PDB file of C-alpha atoms in Angstrom:
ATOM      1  CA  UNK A   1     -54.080 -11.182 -60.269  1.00 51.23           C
ATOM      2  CA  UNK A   2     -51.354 -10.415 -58.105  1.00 49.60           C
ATOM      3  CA  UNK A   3     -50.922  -9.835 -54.103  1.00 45.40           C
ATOM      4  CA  UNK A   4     -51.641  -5.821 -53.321  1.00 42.93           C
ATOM      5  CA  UNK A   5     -51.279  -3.858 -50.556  1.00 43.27           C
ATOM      6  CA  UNK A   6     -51.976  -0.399 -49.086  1.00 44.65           C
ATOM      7  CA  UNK A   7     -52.957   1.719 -46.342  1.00 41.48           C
ATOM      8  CA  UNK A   8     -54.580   5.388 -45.362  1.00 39.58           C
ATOM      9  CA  UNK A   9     -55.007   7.433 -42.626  1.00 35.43           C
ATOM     10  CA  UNK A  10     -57.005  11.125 -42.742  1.00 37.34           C
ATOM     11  CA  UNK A  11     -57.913  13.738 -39.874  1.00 37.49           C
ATOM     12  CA  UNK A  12     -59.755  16.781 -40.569  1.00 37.16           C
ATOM     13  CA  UNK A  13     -62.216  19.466 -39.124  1.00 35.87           C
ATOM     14  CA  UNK A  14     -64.750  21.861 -40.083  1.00 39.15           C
ATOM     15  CA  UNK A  15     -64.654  25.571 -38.708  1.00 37.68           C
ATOM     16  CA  UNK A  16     -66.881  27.291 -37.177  1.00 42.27           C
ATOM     17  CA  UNK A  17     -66.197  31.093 -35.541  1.00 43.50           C
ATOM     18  CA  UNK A  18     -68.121  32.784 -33.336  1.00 40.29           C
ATOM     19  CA  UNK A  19     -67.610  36.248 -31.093  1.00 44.17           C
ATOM     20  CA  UNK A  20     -68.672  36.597 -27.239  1.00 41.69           C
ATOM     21  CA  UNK A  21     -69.017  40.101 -25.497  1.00 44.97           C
ATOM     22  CA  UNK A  22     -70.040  41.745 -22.130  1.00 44.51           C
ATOM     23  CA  UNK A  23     -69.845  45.040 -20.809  1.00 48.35           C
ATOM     24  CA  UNK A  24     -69.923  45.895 -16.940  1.00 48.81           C
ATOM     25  CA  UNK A  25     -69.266  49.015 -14.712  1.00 49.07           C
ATOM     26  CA  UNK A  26     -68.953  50.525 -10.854  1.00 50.55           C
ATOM     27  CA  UNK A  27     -71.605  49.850  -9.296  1.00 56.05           C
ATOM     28  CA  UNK A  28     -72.997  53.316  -7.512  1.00 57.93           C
ATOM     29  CA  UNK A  29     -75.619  54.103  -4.839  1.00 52.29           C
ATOM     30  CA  UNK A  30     -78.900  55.886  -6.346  1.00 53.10           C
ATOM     31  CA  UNK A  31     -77.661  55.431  -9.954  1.00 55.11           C
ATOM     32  CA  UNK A  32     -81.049  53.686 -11.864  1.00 54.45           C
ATOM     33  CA  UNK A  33     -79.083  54.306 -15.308  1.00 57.21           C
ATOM     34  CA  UNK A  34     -77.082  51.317 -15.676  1.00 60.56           C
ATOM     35  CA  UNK A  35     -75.290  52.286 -18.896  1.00 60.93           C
ATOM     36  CA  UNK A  36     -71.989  52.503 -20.083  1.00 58.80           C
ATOM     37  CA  UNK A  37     -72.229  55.829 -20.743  1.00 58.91           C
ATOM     38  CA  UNK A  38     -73.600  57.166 -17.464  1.00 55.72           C
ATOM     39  CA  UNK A  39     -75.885  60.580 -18.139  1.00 59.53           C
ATOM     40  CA  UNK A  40     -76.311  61.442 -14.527  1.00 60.37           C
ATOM     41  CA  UNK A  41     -74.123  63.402 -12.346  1.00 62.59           C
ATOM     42  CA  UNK A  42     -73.354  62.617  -8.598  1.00 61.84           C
ATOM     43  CA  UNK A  43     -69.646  62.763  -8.065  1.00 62.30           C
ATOM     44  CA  UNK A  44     -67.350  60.522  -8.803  1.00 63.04           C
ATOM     45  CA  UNK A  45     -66.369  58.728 -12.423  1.00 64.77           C
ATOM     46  CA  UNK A  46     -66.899  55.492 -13.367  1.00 63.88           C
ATOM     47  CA  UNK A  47     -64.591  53.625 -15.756  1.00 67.54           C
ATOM     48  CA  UNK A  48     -67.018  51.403 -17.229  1.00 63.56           C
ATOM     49  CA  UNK A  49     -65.475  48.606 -20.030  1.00 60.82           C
ATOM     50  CA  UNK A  50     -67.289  46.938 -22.905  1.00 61.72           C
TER      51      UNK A  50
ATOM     52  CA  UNK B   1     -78.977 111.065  41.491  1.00 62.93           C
ATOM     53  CA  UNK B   2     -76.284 114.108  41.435  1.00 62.30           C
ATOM     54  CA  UNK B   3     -73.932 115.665  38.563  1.00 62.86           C
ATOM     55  CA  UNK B   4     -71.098 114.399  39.750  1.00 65.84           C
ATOM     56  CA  UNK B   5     -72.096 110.512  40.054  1.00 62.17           C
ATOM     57  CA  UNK B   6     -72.945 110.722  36.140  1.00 59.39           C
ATOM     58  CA  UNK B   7     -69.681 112.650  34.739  1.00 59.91           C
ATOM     59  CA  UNK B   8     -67.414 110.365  36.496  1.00 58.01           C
ATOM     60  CA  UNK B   9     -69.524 107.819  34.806  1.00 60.33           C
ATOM     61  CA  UNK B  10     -68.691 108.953  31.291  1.00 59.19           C
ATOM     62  CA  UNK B  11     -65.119 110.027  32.267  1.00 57.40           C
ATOM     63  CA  UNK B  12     -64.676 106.241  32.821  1.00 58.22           C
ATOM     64  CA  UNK B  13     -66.589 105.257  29.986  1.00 59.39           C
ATOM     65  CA  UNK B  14     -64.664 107.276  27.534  1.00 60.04           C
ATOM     66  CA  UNK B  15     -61.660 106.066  29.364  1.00 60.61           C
ATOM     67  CA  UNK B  16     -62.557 102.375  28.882  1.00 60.74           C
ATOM     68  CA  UNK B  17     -63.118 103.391  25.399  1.00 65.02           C
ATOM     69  CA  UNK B  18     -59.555 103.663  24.650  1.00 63.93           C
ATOM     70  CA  UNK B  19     -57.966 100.077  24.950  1.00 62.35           C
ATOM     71  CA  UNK B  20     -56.119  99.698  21.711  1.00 59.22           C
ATOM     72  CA  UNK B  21     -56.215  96.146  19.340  1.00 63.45           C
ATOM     73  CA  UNK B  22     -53.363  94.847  17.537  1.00 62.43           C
ATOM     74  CA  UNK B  23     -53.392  92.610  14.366  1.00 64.71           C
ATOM     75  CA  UNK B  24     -54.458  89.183  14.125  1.00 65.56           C
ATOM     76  CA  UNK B  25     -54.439  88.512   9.726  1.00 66.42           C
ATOM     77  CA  UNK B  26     -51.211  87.002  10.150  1.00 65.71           C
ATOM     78  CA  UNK B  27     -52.323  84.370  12.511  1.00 67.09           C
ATOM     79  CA  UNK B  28     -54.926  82.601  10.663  1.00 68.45           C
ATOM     80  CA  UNK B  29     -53.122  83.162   7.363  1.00 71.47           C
ATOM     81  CA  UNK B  30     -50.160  81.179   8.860  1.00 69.37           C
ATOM     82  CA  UNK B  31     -52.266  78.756  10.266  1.00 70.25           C
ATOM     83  CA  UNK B  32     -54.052  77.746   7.146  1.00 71.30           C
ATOM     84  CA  UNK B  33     -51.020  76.669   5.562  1.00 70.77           C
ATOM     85  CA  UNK B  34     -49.841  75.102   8.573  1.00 72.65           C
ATOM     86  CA  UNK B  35     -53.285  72.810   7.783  1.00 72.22           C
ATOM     87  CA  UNK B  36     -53.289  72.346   4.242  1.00 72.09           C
ATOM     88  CA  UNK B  37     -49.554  70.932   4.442  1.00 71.20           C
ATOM     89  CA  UNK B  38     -50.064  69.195   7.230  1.00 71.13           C
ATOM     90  CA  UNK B  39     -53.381  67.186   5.468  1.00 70.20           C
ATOM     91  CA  UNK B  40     -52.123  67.176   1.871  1.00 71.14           C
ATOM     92  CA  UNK B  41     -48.611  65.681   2.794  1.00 73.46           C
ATOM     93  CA  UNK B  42     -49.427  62.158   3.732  1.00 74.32           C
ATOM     94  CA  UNK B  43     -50.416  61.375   0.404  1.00 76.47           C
ATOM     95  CA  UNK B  44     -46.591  60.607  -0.752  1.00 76.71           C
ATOM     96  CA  UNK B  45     -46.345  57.299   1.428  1.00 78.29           C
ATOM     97  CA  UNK B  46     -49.425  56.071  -1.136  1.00 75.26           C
ATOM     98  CA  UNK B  47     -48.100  57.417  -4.220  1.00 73.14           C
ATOM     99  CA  UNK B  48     -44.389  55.933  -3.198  1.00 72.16           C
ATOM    100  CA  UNK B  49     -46.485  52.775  -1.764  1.00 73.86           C
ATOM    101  CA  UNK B  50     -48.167  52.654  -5.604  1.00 74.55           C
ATOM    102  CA  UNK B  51     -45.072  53.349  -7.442  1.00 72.94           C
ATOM    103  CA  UNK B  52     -42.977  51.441  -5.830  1.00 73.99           C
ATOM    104  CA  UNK B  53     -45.320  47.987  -5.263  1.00 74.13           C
ATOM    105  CA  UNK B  54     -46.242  46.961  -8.835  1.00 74.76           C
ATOM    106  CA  UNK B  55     -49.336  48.905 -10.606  1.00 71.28           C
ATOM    107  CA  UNK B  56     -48.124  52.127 -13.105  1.00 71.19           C
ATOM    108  CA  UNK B  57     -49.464  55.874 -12.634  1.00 69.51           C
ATOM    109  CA  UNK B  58     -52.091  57.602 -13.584  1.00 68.64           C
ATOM    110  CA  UNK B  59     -54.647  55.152 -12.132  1.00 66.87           C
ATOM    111  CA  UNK B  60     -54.021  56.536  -8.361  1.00 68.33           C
ATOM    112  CA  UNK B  61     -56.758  58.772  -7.999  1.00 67.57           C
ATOM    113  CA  UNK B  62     -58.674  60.254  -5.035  1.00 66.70           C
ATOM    114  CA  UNK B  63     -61.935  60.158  -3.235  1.00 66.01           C
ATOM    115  CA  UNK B  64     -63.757  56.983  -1.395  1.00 66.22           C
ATOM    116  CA  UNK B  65     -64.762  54.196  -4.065  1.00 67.10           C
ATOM    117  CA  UNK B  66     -62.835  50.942  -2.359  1.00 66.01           C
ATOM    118  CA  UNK B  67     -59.287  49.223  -3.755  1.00 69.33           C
ATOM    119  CA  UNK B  68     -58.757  46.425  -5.841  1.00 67.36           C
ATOM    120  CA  UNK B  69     -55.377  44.647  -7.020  1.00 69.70           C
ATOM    121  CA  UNK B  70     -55.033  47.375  -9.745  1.00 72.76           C
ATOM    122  CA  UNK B  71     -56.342  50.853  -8.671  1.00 76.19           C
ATOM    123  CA  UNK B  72     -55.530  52.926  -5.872  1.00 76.41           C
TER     124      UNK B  72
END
């Protein structure tokens, strides 16, 4: 048997995904339907985002 | 009471009833526009303000629902 030598060096990660979401709008004053899509009808608009 | 007391009373009642009236349309119809300009030109120092400042068109709207750092 003769001398040996050697050497090694790895780095490596596992994947994962994911997704995140919210939704939000004006806030009005005697408007109990808080939903995107706003059925009522007081006067004024409200841009809403999702 | 007498006849002559009440027909000089309707002589100068039909006499009264002769003061003429002239027009008065043309007044109020030139003072309504001298209102609506007068209220509806101020708005050009915000849209120049908005324009001019940073943020794009279309979001400058109207009525009373506060200001942020991207609406008008």
């Amino acid at each position: 048997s003769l001398p040996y030598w050697s050497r090694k060096i790895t780095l490596e990660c596992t994947p994962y995904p994911f997704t995140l979401r919210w939704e939000g709008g004006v806030h009005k004053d005697g408007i109990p339907d808080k939903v995107p899509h706003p059925s009522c009808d007081p006067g004024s608009e409200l841009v809403s985002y999702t | 009471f007498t006849l002559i007391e009440l027909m000089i009373v309707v002589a100068i009642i039909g006499i009264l009833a002769a003061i003429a009236i002239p027009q008065y349309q043309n007044y109020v119809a030139r003072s309504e526009g001298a209102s609506a300009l007068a209220t509806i030109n101020p708005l050009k120092t915000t849209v120049e303000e908005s324009l001019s400042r940073g943020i794009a068109g279309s979001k400058i709207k109207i009525g009373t629902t506060a200001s942020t750092a991207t609406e008008t």
